[PDB]
């Protein structure tokens, strides 16, 4: 009964609150997408746009929560780019060992960081891993996590090495399936990194609208923003 353009009207305030809180580039993308929904000619068109807003907004709030830089998908570095720029002396061997699985070079995680020496810098990778493991162990939130390890090598105290942190996030109903499929996708890379002597950590996590608001991977303040905007929108597009 309600037209979609009209649905976007009633949600003007919640979406203004949403756009005001996201990072700039993230806000703009969501703003363009919202106008796409308002001007949607089809229901499939408006649903697809909303799905995108859901993922892009959530990742902007994930960045804010973690004091990480939000990186638009178009600007996200690939695994090959990180190896070439963080581990240049191993890039040739990386290419050779990816001849059978060249798709690995193009893997693009949501976040691709390295320890502070287009890959972002993080002061401590282990600190990020620990807070993921803490919330998983405290709130029962599903994660998967893997660290490359050559043979049975021990960590060492007399020398520092460069390392990568690869993070996948998401806002979708099937959280377990998200983290199980992510770690499986990256398992071959981790084993590759192990053979190259490159230290990497992969983390994957997910939230859905049934998660208790105090238990998400984003600040509860950001949860209310998503629930009041995008999640309500999905209800309106179905019921109308």
């Amino acid at each position, epitope marked *: 009964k309600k037209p979609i353009a009209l649905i976007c009207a009633e949600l003007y305030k919640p979406f203004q609150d949403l756009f005001a809180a996201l990072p700039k580039d993230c806000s703009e993308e969501c703003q363009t997408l919202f106008e796409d929904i308002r001007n949607s000619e089809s229901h499939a068109s408006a649903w697809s746009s909303a799905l995108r807003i859901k993922g892009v907004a959530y990742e902007g709030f994930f960045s804010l929560t973690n004091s990480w830089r939000y990186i638009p998908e178009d600007l996200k570095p690939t695994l090959g780019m990180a190896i070439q720029t963080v581990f240049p002396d191993k890039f040739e061997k990386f290419l050779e060992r990816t001849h059978l699985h060249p798709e690995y070079r193009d893997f693009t995680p949501d976040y691709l960081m390295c320890r502070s020496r287009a890959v972002q810098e993080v002061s401590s990778v*282990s600190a990020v891993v*620990d807070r993921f493991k803490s919330k998983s162990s405290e709130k029962g939130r599903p994660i998967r996590q893997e660290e490359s390890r*050559p*043979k*049975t*090598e*021990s*960590m*060492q*105290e*007399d*020398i520092e*090495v460069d390392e990568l942190l690869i993070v996948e996030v998401g806002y979708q109903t099937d959280i377990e399936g998200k983290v199980i499929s992510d770690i499986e996708k990256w398992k071959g890379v981790v084993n590759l990194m192990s053979h190259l*002597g490159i230290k990497v950590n992969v983390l994957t996590c997910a939230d859905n609208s049934q998660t208790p608001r105090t238990d998400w991977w984003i600040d509860e303040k950001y949860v209310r923003l998503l629930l009041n905007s995008i999640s309500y929108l999905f209800k309106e597009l179905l019921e109308n």
Partner: antibody
Amino acid sequence: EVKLEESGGGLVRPGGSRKLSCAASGFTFSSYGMQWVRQAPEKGLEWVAYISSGSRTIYYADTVKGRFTISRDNPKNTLFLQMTSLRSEDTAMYYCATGYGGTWFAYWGQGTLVTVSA
Amino acid sequence: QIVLSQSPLSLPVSLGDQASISCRSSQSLLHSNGNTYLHWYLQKPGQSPKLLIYKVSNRFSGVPDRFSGSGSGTDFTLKISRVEAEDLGVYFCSQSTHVPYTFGGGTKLEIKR
């Protein structure tokens, strides 16, 4: 001077439990990994466990996995070994050790003797 | 586990002569960080062990310079250029490249008489 001083050794019945301590002095304990090594009488050296400076990384010899726990208290400059389900084969002198900058055993305590017998 | 094979098991040597102790690793001890974590210890009778050499060839501070180490990969050697009476005891190699850290079985240095 760097000194490591173990305590807590003694006599335990098989299946029993014992907690060892190691008091470290003469260096900034909280910045370094700490280790336990043991030696059964007349036998060679066997590494037991390793704990990183901030306790994030812990390794165990396969013969103590599931039975021993290594831990530390950095404000009190103390390293611990909690031993459980002890067996006669665990009878040994227990040394704490550190590399003071590496995973090698550069400094050793005088050791503490643990006898597991009924 | 890494297996460290020491040879000989016992080494009789006259005071003032050189001694050489071999340590062979079942796999390479070269770590992906570029270091090789093979180390040498002396345990004098009734005492705790003492570090002599760390990462193949670095003499530990204060260790007398008659001790030196060499090698690479899986093959390492501890040399005492001129044996003294105080060098009596058991020499161990050990490795901390891989978990578990492991020791050789020990080489007993015996003063010849």
